[PDB]
Every structure is written in structure tokens, then in C-alpha cells.
Enzyme design. Structure first.
Site, PDB file in Angstrom:
ATOM      1  N   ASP A 131      50.388  40.341  47.787  1.00  0.00           N
ATOM      2  CA  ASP A 131      48.961  40.729  48.294  1.00  0.00           C
ATOM      3  C   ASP A 131      48.111  41.270  46.962  1.00  0.00           C
ATOM      4  O   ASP A 131      47.525  42.248  46.968  1.00  0.00           O
ATOM      5  CB  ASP A 131      48.755  41.786  49.402  1.00  0.00           C
ATOM      6  CG  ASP A 131      47.508  42.037  50.373  1.00  0.00           C
ATOM      7  OD1 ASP A 131      46.815  40.874  50.223  1.00  0.00           O
ATOM      8  OD2 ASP A 131      47.623  42.899  50.924  1.00  0.00           O
ATOM      9  N   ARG A 135      40.941  44.646  45.505  1.00  0.00           N
ATOM     10  CA  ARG A 135      40.943  45.576  46.602  1.00  0.00           C
ATOM     11  C   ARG A 135      42.376  46.371  46.628  1.00  0.00           C
ATOM     12  O   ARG A 135      42.370  47.784  47.184  1.00  0.00           O
ATOM     13  CB  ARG A 135      40.501  45.172  47.985  1.00  0.00           C
ATOM     14  CG  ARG A 135      41.819  44.137  48.481  1.00  0.00           C
ATOM     15  CD  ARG A 135      41.403  43.531  49.828  1.00  0.00           C
ATOM     16  NE  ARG A 135      42.470  42.166  49.997  1.00  0.00           N
ATOM     17  CZ  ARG A 135      42.232  41.059  49.696  1.00  0.00           C
ATOM     18  NH1 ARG A 135      41.234  40.595  49.398  1.00  0.00           N
ATOM     19  NH2 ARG A 135      43.312  40.126  50.120  1.00  0.00           N
ATOM     20  N   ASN A 136      43.476  46.048  45.951  1.00  0.00           N
ATOM     21  CA  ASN A 136      44.816  46.473  46.202  1.00  0.00           C
ATOM     22  C   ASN A 136      45.089  47.156  44.614  1.00  0.00           C
ATOM     23  O   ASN A 136      46.204  47.394  44.704  1.00  0.00           O
ATOM     24  CB  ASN A 136      45.683  45.360  46.461  1.00  0.00           C
ATOM     25  CG  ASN A 136      45.461  45.058  48.158  1.00  0.00           C
ATOM     26  OD1 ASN A 136      45.091  46.050  48.944  1.00  0.00           O
ATOM     27  ND2 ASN A 136      46.040  43.968  48.682  1.00  0.00           N
ATOM     28  N   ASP A 149      51.339  49.484  45.807  1.00  0.00           N
ATOM     29  CA  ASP A 149      52.735  48.684  46.110  1.00  0.00           C
ATOM     30  C   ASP A 149      53.097  48.950  47.367  1.00  0.00           C
ATOM     31  O   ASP A 149      54.471  48.912  47.516  1.00  0.00           O
ATOM     32  CB  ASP A 149      53.668  49.050  45.017  1.00  0.00           C
ATOM     33  CG  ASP A 149      53.793  50.499  44.382  1.00  0.00           C
ATOM     34  OD1 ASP A 149      53.163  51.480  45.197  1.00  0.00           O
ATOM     35  OD2 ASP A 149      54.646  50.959  43.830  1.00  0.00           O
TER      36      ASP A 149
HETATM   37  C1  LIG Z   1      39.361  52.511  51.598  1.00  0.00           C
HETATM   38  C2  LIG Z   1      40.379  53.313  51.201  1.00  0.00           C
HETATM   39  C3  LIG Z   1      41.627  53.344  52.233  1.00  0.00           C
HETATM   40  C4  LIG Z   1      40.774  53.514  49.829  1.00  0.00           C
HETATM   41  C5  LIG Z   1      40.227  52.154  48.918  1.00  0.00           C
HETATM   42  O1  LIG Z   1      40.861  50.928  49.152  1.00  0.00           O
HETATM   43  N1  LIG Z   1      42.389  53.382  49.540  1.00  0.00           N
HETATM   44  C6  LIG Z   1      43.051  54.328  48.521  1.00  0.00           C
HETATM   45  N2  LIG Z   1      42.145  55.107  47.955  1.00  0.00           N
HETATM   46  C7  LIG Z   1      42.311  55.959  47.055  1.00  0.00           C
HETATM   47  N3  LIG Z   1      41.552  56.791  46.714  1.00  0.00           N
HETATM   48  C8  LIG Z   1      40.129  57.014  46.746  1.00  0.00           C
HETATM   49  C9  LIG Z   1      39.402  57.668  45.668  1.00  0.00           C
HETATM   50  C10 LIG Z   1      38.056  57.991  46.085  1.00  0.00           C
HETATM   51  C11 LIG Z   1      37.359  57.350  47.270  1.00  0.00           C
HETATM   52  C12 LIG Z   1      35.909  57.759  47.321  1.00  0.00           C
HETATM   53  O2  LIG Z   1      35.153  56.860  47.825  1.00  0.00           O
HETATM   54  O3  LIG Z   1      35.139  58.626  47.070  1.00  0.00           O
HETATM   55  C13 LIG Z   1      38.218  56.620  47.881  1.00  0.00           C
HETATM   56 CL1  LIG Z   1      37.347  55.871  49.344  1.00  0.00          CL
HETATM   57  C14 LIG Z   1      39.470  56.656  47.815  1.00  0.00           C
HETATM   58  C15 LIG Z   1      43.856  55.982  46.832  1.00  0.00           C
HETATM   59  N4  LIG Z   1      44.456  56.790  45.661  1.00  0.00           N
HETATM   60  C16 LIG Z   1      45.463  56.489  46.043  1.00  0.00           C
HETATM   61  N5  LIG Z   1      45.881  55.768  46.910  1.00  0.00           N
HETATM   62  C17 LIG Z   1      47.173  55.153  47.205  1.00  0.00           C
HETATM   63  C18 LIG Z   1      47.260  55.167  48.899  1.00  0.00           C
HETATM   64  C19 LIG Z   1      47.687  53.970  46.645  1.00  0.00           C
HETATM   65  C20 LIG Z   1      44.603  55.222  47.307  1.00  0.00           C
HETATM   66  N6  LIG Z   1      44.293  54.269  48.530  1.00  0.00           N
END
Ligand SMILES: CC(C)[C@H](CO)Nc1nc(Nc2ccc(C(=O)O)c(Cl)c2)c2ncn(C(C)C)c2n1
Length: 270
Positions: A131, A135-136, A149
């Protein structure tokens, strides 16, 4: 395992989002005054044993450009996977929203170098991502990029795995042998890396712009490939194209890809 954590060790702060198989929260590991990311399990989307196996795989992963596992909460529900927090979110949203003067051509080379390094490690360690997309990838301070991962699989480098009957893939990132025969290998991650390079080069544009996903396979078999994006160096586009070779064995390895980007990054800085 020594990875097991008490649920009370973490205090949730804010829900970041989350989609397919679980929500992501920003939390605080109180004992270390450390901001963490907590992955939850969304019931009915993913089975418990499939989620616990993701955590078991992450335990073995140790690289500066691979999201680091901190701990897990398996004993009872709800289950959590605790990782380091990436302050700026995903690379797709980051590229779309950035100041392009700050995130210049050299920063783009820097980002591709970091991703290729993480992939070279997975290639060396006998893992497959399946994947790879912007986005990942997650962004931290000073353009630090780490590959998420959760979906890694153990697969001896060179071997090809077959996906389950009627599996859905993001078509525009998926290698032709994966679309046609549900065959995945490190070479299908090389193809996806090619698409990731194109997303980096265009600052988060959607691949095969305007092209019907149902027509992508036929186009790829008739040797259609995305054109060189505006401002993309020809050497970088030659690499995307080498990643998009029809034959998996004609695609470069991540060791070769990483070496090519390291050279270009050192040269661009000099
Ligand atoms: C949409 C979500 C689920 C996100 C983006 O892909 N995933 C997502 N966002 C992260 N951090 C952030 C940082 C700042 C923001 C902000 O806007 O302020 C957001 Cl949304 C997330 C993250 N950090 C470690 N991980 C592991 C879990 C790897 C994360 N997965």
C-alpha cells in the site's frame, strides 16, 4: 511480550481521523511525558488476530524512515497499537498545502531519498508493503518522512504472494501483474513507489488525471504511462519509468533506487 502496555499508561488527547480499519488518536504516554499516536480497531472491518499480527510484524521493524512501534494493548478490548506521533500528518495533504518555496525541488529529492531508504530496508528484511502511496507516508519537523507500516507482510524478497478472491486494490497505484493475477512482490512495491514519485513531483495531484480506473489496465498493457510532470528533472522521470516496466524483473531494486536518489540529493545540495 515486553511490548504490552497498560491501557491507563496512555491518555487520549484528540482524534486525528481514521478510515478503513480503525481511528487514529493523539495521546500522551504519561510515564515519559511523550506525545504518541494510538491506532484503534474498528469492529466488523478487521478481525482481532489480523490486527494482532500487524503489531507482531511492527515489533521487528526498526528504521529511521519507518513509523516506530512504541507498545501495544492486546490483553482485552479495545485493542490499541501505540506508535510515535508524526506532527504534520500525511505526505499527500502536506504536499497539497505546503509553501512550495519552502518545499522546493531539493526537499522533494530529500523526501524520495527517505522513502526509498525505508523500502530498501524492507527489501533487505523480506517484507512487502502492498500500500505504498503519499497518504501512507507521514511528515514530521524539517521534512522528515516516515512510511506507515500497519499492512506489512513477511515475504522472501523475490517471491510472489497471491491476494484473496475478490480483493479490492487502489487501481492507480497497483502493478499490472497485481491487477490481472492478484500477484504481489517487492517489484509491485517498486511500481507503487513510481506512482508515489509522481505524487511528490506534482505536489499531491491524483494519478491518471481524469482517466477511468476501469481503463487503466488496458492502457498499461498498451504501454501508456503518465507523462513527465511540469518541472520534474528527466533523471527523476527516467526512474519513475524504470519503476513502471511491464516485467517485474525489469524494474530496479530499492537498493538501486535509494542509491540514485542519494546521489541526486547530495549533488542538488552541492
Ligand atoms: C487522517 C489521519 C488518520 C492521519 C492522516 O493520514 N493519520 C495519522 N496521522 C498522524 N498524525 C497527525 C498529525 C497532525 C494532524 C493534523 O491535522 O493536525 C493529523 Cl490529522 C494527524 C500519525 N502520526 C503517527 N501515525 C501512525 C499511526 C502511523 C499517524 N497516522
Amino acid at each position: 511480550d515486553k511490548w504490552e502496555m497498560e491501557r491507563t499508561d496512555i491518555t487520549m488527547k484528540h482524534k486525528l481521523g481514521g478510515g478503513q480499519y480503525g481511528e487514529v488518536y493523539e495521546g500522551v504516554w504519561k510515564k515519559y511525558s511523550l506525545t504518541v499516536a494510538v491506532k484503534t480497531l474498528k469492529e466488523d472491518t478487521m478481525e482481532v488476530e489480523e490486527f494482532l499480527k500487524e503489531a507482531a510484524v511492527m515489533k521487528e521493524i526498526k528504521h529511521p524512515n519507518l513509523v516506530q512501534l512504541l507498545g501495544v494493548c492486546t490483553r482485552e478490548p479495545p485493542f490499541y497499537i501505540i506508535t510515535e506521533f508524526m506532527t504534520y500528518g500525511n505526505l499527500l495533504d502536506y504536499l497539497r498545502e505546503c509553501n512550495r518555496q519552502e518545499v522546493s525541488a531539493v526537499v522533494l529529492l530529500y523526501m524520495a531519498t527517505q522513502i526509498s531508504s525505508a523500502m530498501e530496508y524492507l527489501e533487505k528484511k523480506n517484507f512487502i508493503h502492498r500500500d505504498l502511496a503519499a497518504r501512507n507516508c507521514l511528515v514530521g519537523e524539517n521534512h522528515l518522512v516516515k512510511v506507515a507500516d500497519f499492512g506489512l507482510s513477511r515475504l522472501m524478497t523475490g517471491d510472489t504472494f497471491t491476494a484473496h478472491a475478490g480483493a479490492k486494490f487502489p487501481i492507480k497505484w497497483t502493478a499490472p501483474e497485481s491487477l490481472a493475477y492478484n500477484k504481489f512482490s517487492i517489484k509491485s512495491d517498486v511500481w507503487a513507489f513510481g506512482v508515489l514519485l509522481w505524487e511528490i513531483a506534482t505536489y499531491g495531484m491524483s494519478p491518471y488525471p481524469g482517466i477511468d480506473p476501469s481503463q487503466v489496465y488496458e492502457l498499461l498493457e498498451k504501454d501508456y504511462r503518465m507523462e513527465r510532470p511540469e518541472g520534474c528533472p528527466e533523471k527523476v522521470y527516467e526512474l519513475m519509468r524504470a519503476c513502471w516496466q511491464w516485467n517485474p524483473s525489469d524494474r530496479p531494486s530499492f537498493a538501486e533506487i535509494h542509491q540514485a536518489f542519494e546521489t541526486m540529493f547530495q549533488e542538488s545540495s552541492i
